[PDB]
Design a protein around this ligand. Sequence first.
Ligand SMILES: Nc1ncnc2c1ncn2[C@@H]1O[C@H](COP(=O)(O)OP(=O)(O)O)[C@@H](O)[C@H]1O
Ligand SMILES: Nc1ncnc2c1ncn2[C@@H]1O[C@H](COP(=O)(O)OP(=O)(O)O)[C@@H](O)[C@H]1O
Ligand SMILES: Nc1ncnc2c1ncn2[C@@H]1O[C@H](COP(=O)(O)OP(=O)(O)O)[C@@H](O)[C@H]1O
Lengths: 474, 723
Amino acid sequence: NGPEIMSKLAGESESNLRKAFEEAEKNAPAIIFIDELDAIAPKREKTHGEVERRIVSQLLTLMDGLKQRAHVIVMAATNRPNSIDPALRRFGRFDREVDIGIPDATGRLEILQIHTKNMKLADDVDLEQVANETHGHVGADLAALCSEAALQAIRKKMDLIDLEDETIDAEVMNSLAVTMDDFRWALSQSNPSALRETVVEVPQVTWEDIGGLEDVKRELQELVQYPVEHPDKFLKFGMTPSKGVLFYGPPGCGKTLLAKAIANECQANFISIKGPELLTMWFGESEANVREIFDKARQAAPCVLFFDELDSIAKARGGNIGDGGGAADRVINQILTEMDGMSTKKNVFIIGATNRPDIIDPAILRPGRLDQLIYIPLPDEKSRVAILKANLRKSPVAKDVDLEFLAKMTNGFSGADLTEICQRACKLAIRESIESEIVPEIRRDHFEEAMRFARRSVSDNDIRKYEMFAQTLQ
Amino acid sequence: NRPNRLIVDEAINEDNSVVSLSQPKMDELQLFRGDTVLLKGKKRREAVCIVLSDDTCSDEKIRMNRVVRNNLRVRLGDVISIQPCPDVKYGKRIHVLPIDDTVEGITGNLFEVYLKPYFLEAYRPIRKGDIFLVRGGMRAVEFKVVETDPSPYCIVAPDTVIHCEGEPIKREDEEESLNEVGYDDIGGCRKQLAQIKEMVELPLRHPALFKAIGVKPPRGILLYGPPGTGKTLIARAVANETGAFFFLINGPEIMSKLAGESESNLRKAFEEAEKNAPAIIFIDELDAIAPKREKTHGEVERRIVSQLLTLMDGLKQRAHVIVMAATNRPNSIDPALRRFGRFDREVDIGIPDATGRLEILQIHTKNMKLADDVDLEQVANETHGHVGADLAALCSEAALQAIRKKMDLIDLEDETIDAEVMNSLAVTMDDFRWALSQSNPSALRETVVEVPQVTWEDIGGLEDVKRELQELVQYPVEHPDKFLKFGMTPSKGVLFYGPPGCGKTLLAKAIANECQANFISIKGPELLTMWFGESEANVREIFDKARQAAPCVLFFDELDSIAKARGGNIGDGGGAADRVINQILTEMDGMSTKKNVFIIGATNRPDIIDPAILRPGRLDQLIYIPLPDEKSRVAILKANLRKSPVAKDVDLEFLAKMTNGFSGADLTEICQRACKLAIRESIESEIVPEIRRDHFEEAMRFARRSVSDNDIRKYEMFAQTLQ
Ligand SMILES: Nc1ncnc2c1ncn2[C@@H]1O[C@H](COP(=O)(O)OP(=O)(O)O)[C@@H](O)[C@H]1O
Ligand SMILES: Nc1ncnc2c1ncn2[C@@H]1O[C@H](COP(=O)(O)OP(=O)(O)O)[C@@H](O)[C@H]1O
Ligand SMILES: Nc1ncnc2c1ncn2[C@@H]1O[C@H](COP(=O)(O)OP(=O)(O)O)[C@@H](O)[C@H]1O
């Protein structure tokens, strides 16, 4: 343990590092697990006092003092890869690295089942909702979440039973069952508080959640799927697979869905960097963190790395009017750099998305960075049907509702504009069944009400200004 | 289950002998209201009281004073045997003596100063050997019942006699003091006492249940808040409430010892507690011991941190202890202490608000008599920056300000001052008003978190929006079912817009009061502070307070303030993104949409607001609060003036149509200048407790409208883009 070795007297500790390993050499095969390594050897700038420096240098000697000696392994654990002294990382000492991430909704369910397996849940309890609804938790937070809900059941029920026992009865404790009402309470506590950083997972959304866009679903497949799944031809004919794609178009039309969909299609990891996280690096004047993203994407491979509203920094500085300067800025510069040094033979794949393609820096569109411009436009009447079908699967709509009539009612409605038309009806519905509480369907009279509030966010010039752009692409 | 057995419980009454049971519980026992009962608890003894009609209570459990809980040798969450003892009786003779320690330093007769106001018209059922308590004379004095008539079995009516010889006994180890701390001593804290009570309830009260079941209790508990908030007093109270040995480590104490002599003192401290289990180890100032982040200088200090870490997970089993540490700021601690298994559970004990300050003032004034004019409310309502320990000093100052007025001249020369004067000395409002003039008003000033007082009855007009807010806030917490059924996700926030002064800020505090949530207000100059100061890292610190104060409404006021400062319409060559509003969107997205925190922005310049805030999932719903109408301007003028009692010759509804585009702000000083005129003339002509129309038709001269012809319609030209 890290503190264990550092709480001892200086030189009494040196005993404890030394005699620890040959103790393991006498027992081989053996695994020496160093608990907190960055407590022992966090030397980069740290480096103060004679004793601490000596304990780092001691550990380095013991790592390559492993010569032969039969068979041991040294497994150390640390929070951040960067706190360690790089002299530990050198070959022969800690060469192999594994990244154990936070769990996602798929995995959280496994964790919850592992810790609830000794206790009986009620019939209503479905761990899914608990699993699906805790989006920031690590594993040890779910182990506390399950222990709270258990005692919330005891501080309801057996509290009154008042069994006075030096050994409590077996026949009541077994019989005590935990309801959903408890989990919903434990989720009200502070265990929801958990560590919040880059989400890395496999997106759930499949193509069946995307209406329309029949060409582009294919384009993406031939751009991503082939060069991993047919490496032969690209050697044969010789071409190099493109590194990335840039979506453009009007807002709300599904640029972001397509990205998560192709990641689910191919079972890769999806990393989303949203515009405000690029603007954070721009005001904060730290663009050194762009390098830290790619080194996560590299390590999470296969991955798709999705930069969303990539036009955000060029808008913040004024865009069309802008300042007297040009289109280079320090965050987008730092992307091009980390983009070039990336291995073109690995599986990482970059997707940008922007709805202001004119103000984008022309240096991104050169070959070898983002080659392929794809245009996702306002959907058509055939698609607006598919959109409305797609969104509403969540709520079961009645049959008197003719969507395809509502389709032609909407002209330039984007995939975003239609989604709240569905959602205001979901406000009306929930209202009246509460309103008239003092019916599990949705009726046309809802929609023709919400019709009043329908807006289009895309003007006459906006739609064509995009077209006046794509005509320069002929 | 033999349902004359009930659970003991705390008391909402201070009365020395009273029990609180609701209407059903006395009925299933089939018993009267003014009865004399009997209570047989653990450790074979008993006592008698007067029950009272209760309402709230619970299914079954008995609200009881700490005094009677102490005789019975019982503690909250234990059970007690009541059967009615309707047998009545009247006193002939009582013999009671107090104890030396509680009377130490006093002069003369005991009876009159206390017993004579005490036993009168109570008709209280004394029992023999009963240690009871009386307050007065700027202290508390204990009395025990020694030898008595028809034993034990007594009742005190004027026809009894009393006598006390004047030799006290020396109390023994078998009984526990009332000079110690209990939940009565704590005020302004209910939520946090709640949270803490059941974290420590089962493991302390019932250790063998965990020696059976395989569930793991919490070990570390960490308390927050600025100094003088009562952190030490809350941990010590709980320990003496459950009966667990309370060991106390101090930060400087451990750090003043020699290096390695200290290491002794951390080590031997815990197993000392392991030998005494159940035990609570209270670390006084933890950030004095282990403040390691950058701090980290010298070999010895680093070693003492690492020592404490080892002792926290060296708690493996070992039977049952708890470690409660207190610290000023959560961020000064070394994060290695926070990791699971060491200090996992955190409680935030905030500064008290006006509601709670009154409880604190009453707790510290309860041993002294206030004058009739004194109302602690004004003192409580008028100290807005004080923590609890400032009110404990505020009450001690006012007490001596009464002595350095009055008994200073009395010049009693005593080695033991007289009891008959000190009790008689009463404290006026004139003293409190002075103590509030001293430096104790100085106290710690940071984010106010409370429940707003203003209810809808303080808001005139705005009939739609009062509903809109209710369906936006109230439903998704109070009907989670449907949003699962139909599937929609509840909106996170609202954005008010409109003209200035029309009540955007009132609506916010009102819906927080409506729903009993906490209200956090971030005012525009506090956003501009972060913008000039170039530290937007503090936006993250607000939300982590709002998260922790949940249920909360987080109200950003004049959210247009940074866009105005950089020029707005003209502005600079740049666009609408800036670093503080950016940092809000970020912390907004990462927030749990299933928690109860709810965000309200307000702006009167909605055109210059960054369009990125209005996307779905951030602030969805624009609401427009306009200049009130003649029906409302009546309700406004009615609402403001409740403070002062207006006369009947004043026709407001005539004044209503006089005001056209007067906002809710413009009308408020029309009421206020009349309040200047009034106060003037009654001083002016001093050398009338009404307000007369001649005031108003004077103030009419000074009426202005702050909203021009274009301003009102420019807002409308905005809302027409919203069709
Ligand atoms: N083609 C589509 N199929 C299904 N849903 C869509 C489609 N286009 C838009 N939406 C809906 O619109 C919302 C916003 O789409 P988004 O992916 O944000 O587009 P953009 O990234 O261009 O703004 C999503 O919630 C999605 O449900
Ligand atoms: N919330 C409170 N209620 C009642 N008394 C308080 C409260 N807070 C402080 N006091 C008074 O202040 C004194 C010192 O408080 P203390 O426990 O030292 O605060 P902390 O431990 O947080 O520094 C206590 O004796 C108590 O009488
Ligand atoms: N509808 C109203 N009902 C009661 N008082 C109002 C109303 N509108 C404005 N006021 C008064 O105007 C003052 C300023 O209102 P405020 O909440 O600051 O509005 P805003 O936040 O738009 O400036 C408050 O003191 C309040 O008493």
